[PDB]
Amino acid sequence: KQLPNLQVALDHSNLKGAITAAVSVGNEVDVIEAGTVCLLQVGSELVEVLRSLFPDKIIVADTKCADAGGTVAKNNAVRGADWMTCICSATIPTMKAARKAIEDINPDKGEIQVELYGDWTYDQAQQWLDAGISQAIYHQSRDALLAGETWGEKDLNKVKKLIEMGFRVSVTGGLSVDTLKLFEGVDVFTFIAGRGITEAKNPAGAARAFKDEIKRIWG
Amino acid sequence: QLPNLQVALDHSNLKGAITAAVSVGNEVDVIEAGTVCLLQVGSELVEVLRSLFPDKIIVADTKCADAGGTVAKNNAVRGADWMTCICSATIPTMKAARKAIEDINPDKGEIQVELYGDWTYDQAQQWLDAGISQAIYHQSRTWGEKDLNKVKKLIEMGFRVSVTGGLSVDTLKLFEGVDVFTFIAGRGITEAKNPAGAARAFKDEIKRIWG
What we know:
Chain A: InterPro entries: Aldolase_TIM, HPS/KGPDC, OMPdeCOase_dom, RibuloseP-bd_barrel. Chain A: Mg(2+) binds at residues 33, 62, 115. The structure is a homodimer. With 219 residues, chain A is α/β, with parallel strands linked by helices. Helices cover 45% and strands 19% of the residues of chain A. In chain A, strand 1 (5-10), helix 1 (15-25) and strand 2 form a beta-alpha-beta unit. In chain A, helix 1 (15-25) runs parallel beside helix 3 and helix 4 runs parallel beside helix 5 (92-105).
């Protein structure tokens, strides 16, 4: 058993913003993620820079891969990624090819995570598990997120159900040190924070406070 | 207009994409920076292609799922005409992407929906209602009736449909009578002994059939 991870997403539109934010919080987080917006802007060298700065941190290449799973996984695994995202639209053969490629380069830590967008089903989710993929990323309902709302029961129910199916579930959106308590009793695998922490007055302090609260609730 | 010939650049490095584009650019209508390539090299490739081919349609194949306005802006400022969104992107994301690309590129700026997994005609109608009327259809993994029939309905609904997968000079026959908007070729053309000649042959067969 371990505590939920604190992950920082880097969704910057340029290389300097990602690197500066990563350096500001890196020591205080468990996982550092090169976000899709950033990767589409700067390419995969960022993954390698992050690996150099943080030899022992978990690194996520958030490619939201839909196709050419083996190639995209290999491309980011050789840069040093541990986890890569596939969009839930990706077929089972694409997801398996990506898993096989990332495991080939990184047997110890290599994994695929399914990014949950649109009308995905639990029947699809079981297909991911059967294909050896057991991480999923769940986003707060965007309407509620944009409105500043708490996590609603419907969102919590889906998170709970995925966990019960056997997923390690990461959540993102609507997360702050004060809102972690909403998740009390929910076996969240990773909390993914972004600008709330990296744009704070003291990002390292904000990151540590977030992890302190994870420790209070789940410790 | 006849169906467009498009070349997809899915290389894992910059030199591969640039070399392939230069080899066939004059002979095609549309040049696409594929997702595999953009994830490797970033968006500068789009602006390089725009400089090389000022009068060609340029596609930024980002398969955008979220941050629509940001992703579309980032690629439109590089000179993209069309950008792909994955079909699982929400309507708000697709709409934000469309509005951002139209703002920078009022001439040609458009979103195209990339079709993967279990999509429905009901979802497709929401894309049309959202102002998005291009969709990319991939051969199931010789074009058979199930695939052709889906292509035909999408066109009926009001989509400009691009097709990709299993395309050659010889399989263009199979699409006789269908109002294909764009045929997307890739390595079949760019890895040929004479890429410019393979592409020209391709466009010549389009001209024969739809001309």
